[model samples]
Target chain A: MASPLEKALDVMVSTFHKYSGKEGDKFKLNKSELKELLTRELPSFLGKRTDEAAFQKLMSNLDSNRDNEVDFQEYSVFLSSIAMMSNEFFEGFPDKQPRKK
Target chain B: MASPLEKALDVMVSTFHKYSGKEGDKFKLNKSELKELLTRELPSFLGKRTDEAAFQKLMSNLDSNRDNEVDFQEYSVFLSSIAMMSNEFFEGFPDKQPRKK
Candidate 1:
């Protein structure tokens, strides 16, 4: 059986595939798309951002390779890394930061 | 027609009603419950945490009343406030914090 982590990575890949115009001509997962996708698809952790700020922050994190672009590999790594933040991770889904806006 | 915000608010209210066991005996949306619901139902921002650290952080913010519990009204207010974050909030979601773990 695939590890939950592995299974999750595949799903993440599929998500990117779908979002990045691979699977169905959907728009690529830009930072904004990433934010929207996470907020909408991964509700277990982000359900709190139903209309919250963390939505943006989550996108910023995925920009991990930080070239200011989120590509397939970057997105995959992100899902792989975060996959463990489940009941684990430093602050798995920290509170929305105090608004700077 | 109801304004999008109002419609959104109604959906949110129903979410609370649903999560709080008021709608279908699913169980009350305590802070933790609120976190899970946010993560699952509202995925755009959260999907990133499908296993990431930001997942936990999002919850901390929702416990805003500081009573250590997330009540209906508080939940509603948070929803209304963050709804805009969908477009404009600052430094919102959490990045997976570096670990000592």
Candidate 2:
């Protein structure tokens, strides 16, 4: 059986493909694909606001090579950033229980 | 109502605390804690070899700041690398069924 950590890693990879394969390139995420992923998978992060301008800004930042698309490496880095942000939040409220909301 | 990706991120954060809290610097993972994490949580990635030398080398690489301990950022980066490696493997074998072993 896969450990929790291993399963988490698997989710990271599988979720990328789940979005990346929905359109062009088949191995990368176009702007629309990424937006949908963010909206659906990370509603808490984006909150109720579905601002296109903010999402576009985010896409610009995530597209490190200026390719206008996000490769797996880029996506992995983005996830790392999210994880770091989540870590900081946890650090601030050490007593807060996570995964409940 | 956390999505799969959100839950996975939670797992990443929770697993780190699981080991990091076992020793000094509650927010960071010491060498012993990291070794135990690798051996137990990533047995497939580490395999059955249990090579101390390889683990030491990995620890050196992961401890990029030369502090001999891995903070959350470093750990997040490590998971990203693992996810990238796993992604590459899947790319090569797109038909391979995952999470079965």
Candidate 3:
């Protein structure tokens, strides 16, 4: 049995492939594949809006190599950024209990 | 309801706090905290080796700012690198099923 942290890492990797294999390259995420991935796998992150312009801007930022597709490295970085933001949000909360021994 | 990917992100953030709050700066992972995290949460990755030298080297690499502690950003990048390595391993396998619609 994998630990929660290990399972989380597996989920991140497997989820990327679930979308990346949808179209061209098979190992990268094209525009539509990325959009579907965000809309489905990250609904809370995307929210209710379907803003094409915002999605395009996000795609541009994620496509660091100007390849018009997101490779695993880029996708991993994107998830890391989101995790950092989430960590910051968590930091705002007071510690509810003493640290475990 | 949060999707699996969203839940995975949440797990990543929460797991960091689980260890980061153990000692020293609450927002950063001290050497002991990181060792515990890797030993327990990532046993599969670390294997049965109790190699202090390897652990010290890993800590040095993860403590990119030379702070001797890993902040959320550093930890996130560490996990991201692991995820990328896992992705590469996954890529070696041929697709076993057709892509979902």
Candidate 4:
């Protein structure tokens, strides 16, 4: 059985394909698919925002090669950025010392 | 409530802190902490390879800023790279189209 971190990594890879394969190229995410993924899989982070301009801005930023679609590498980079932002929330906590048990 | 993807991201963030605060800087992962994390949370991915040299090399590679420790950003980048590699593994398989359900 995969451990928590390992399973988490699997979730990252599987979730992308779950949406990317929905339309157009099976290896990349189109606008609608990206929207669906953000809405469904990242509800807490993305909230219920439906701003087209904001979504477009995100797509543009994530599509590093300006390909109008997000490949795995681009998507991974985007996820990492999100993870970094999330890390900041944890950093502000007062107690962070490693557990002794 | 967080979705699977959101929880996965949280797992990534929380798992880092779970080990990173063992010693040294509370926000960074020392060699021992990294080893513990890999062994415990990534058992399937890492296997039982008690390789000192390999671990050393991994630490060296991950310690990008020459800081001798892995910060959240560095750790996030590493996970992304690993995710990318796993993506390639999935790419080699026959079925990759988006799910219909």
Candidate 5:
């Protein structure tokens, strides 16, 4: 059986395909696909706001290659950034963290 | 209350801390800490084999700053690469993929 971390990586991979296969390129997520994925799967992070301008800006930033579509590499990079933010938040409260058993 | 993706991100963050706090440098993973984390949490990825050379190589590669330690940023980058590999594997079989809802 896969461990939680293994499953976590699987979830990351599957979630991208779940949205990227919706339309257009099939392997990559266009702006609409990315927006929908972020809205549905990452609601907590993106918030409930449906600001088109905000999404446009996010898409532009994530599309590092300027291909107008976010591929797995770009999407993974974005996720890493989010993970980094979460890391920072946790790092801020070291005392609250459980001690090593 | 968190979405699956959010939970996944949380898992990623927590797993790092779980091992990173076990030894020296509570904020980063030393070689032994990283090995334990991989062998325990990422068993499927690392397999049951206890190959020291492979892990040594991985440690060398992941220690991008030559600090001989793996921080959250480095760990996240490694996970991102694994996600990318998983993406490539899934992308190879288009028809086998489930259709969009």
Candidate 6:
């Protein structure tokens, strides 16, 4: 049985491989992957590009590697971080799983 | 440019669509996608699953929809919730982005 994180990673790999092709494929994000990521998922705020330039700017901030390619780990950390940031998320999630003993 | 949530959602869609195929794809995780996600990326504690039965029990708990399919939103919420739950995730994500002014 895979752990939650492991399952997430598998989903990430399968997700990447499907569109990006293979590991060697590189699967360039024509625009900022982060930007693209935002618009698609949330139909409200970011989807509307509440501040388009700001959004792009934010991506640049997150793109620490500056490789133009955000690694899965980076993406995971990034998204997890977002969830982390949401005060609602904080209240909503902790009890969802069994105490991590 | 997308909001952090949007990007996270985008990644989730891309992740799900990649492997699960389409909404009709009915991708059934054999061992478990969550477990796989963690093991591949984070070489840390949960990967070991000191309690395999507990892991399975966890899945059963999280799989409330119990459609035998963890949908994209469910998966997203699940992962994000996991991220949400992690105290480490809380400290790591928000400052990564701007003040959202």
Chain B TM-scores, listed for every candidate in order, come to 0.55, 0.75, 0.76, 0.76, 0.78, 0.49
User: Superposing all C-alpha atoms, what RMSD in Å does each candidate have to the true structure?
Assistant: 14.3, 7.7, 7.4, 6.8, 7.0, 11.9
lDDT tens per residue, model 3, A1-101 = 02765766766767777788889757677888888877777776765664777567767776676566776656766777777666655656423212220
lDDT tens digits, residue span B26-90, model 2: 66667888888778777777656558775677777766665666666567667767776777576
Candidate 4 residue lDDT tens string, A1-101: 12665666667767787788999766777888877777777676666574666567777887665656676656776777777667755667423323220
lDDT per residue for candidate 3 within B1-101, as digits (tens), equals: 12765766657667777888899766677888877777776776664653777567777877676567776656766777777667655656423212220
Whole-model lDDT values for every prediction: 0.43, 0.67, 0.66, 0.66, 0.68, 0.43
Residue B6 in model 5: lDDT: 58
Per-residue lDDT over B7-86 for candidate 5, one digit per residue giving the tens place of the 0 to 100 score: 66757767787788989767777889888877887776666564777667777776565567777656766776666566
- lDDT agreement of model 2 with the native: 0.67
Model 4 chain B scores worst on lDDT over the 10 consecutive residues at B92-101
DockQ, every prediction? 0.03, 0.25, 0.25, 0.29, 0.27, 0.10
User: Better model by DockQ, 2 or 6?
Assistant: 2
How well is each residue in A17-95 modelled by candidate 6, as lDDT tens digits? 2433333324323234444554553345354563568555655554555544444334445555553344224345543
Q: What lDDT tens digits, residue by residue, belong to model 5 across residues A66-86?
A: 667777766767777777667
Off by over 4 Å in 3: A88-101, B48-50, B88-101
Worst 10 residues of 3 chain A by lDDT: A92-101
TM-score of each: 0.35, 0.79, 0.78, 0.80, 0.79, 0.37
Say which candidate scores most in DockQ: 4
Query: Docking category for candidate 1?
Result: incorrect
Better of 3 and 5 by TM-score: 5
Is 2 or 6 the stronger prediction by lDDT? 2
Mind giving the per-residue lDDT tens digits that candidate 1 earns over B1-101? 01232123334445655665633223235555555666665564455464534534554565454444454444544443433232122224322212110
lDDT of 6 by residue, B28-84 (tens): 332355445434433343555635574466455545555444444444555655543
Where in model 5 is the C-alpha error above 4 Å? A48-50, A88-101, B48-50, B89-101
**In model 2, which regions exceed 4 Å deviation?**
A1-4, A88-101, B88-101
Models sorted by DockQ, best on top: 4, 5, 3, 2, 6, 1
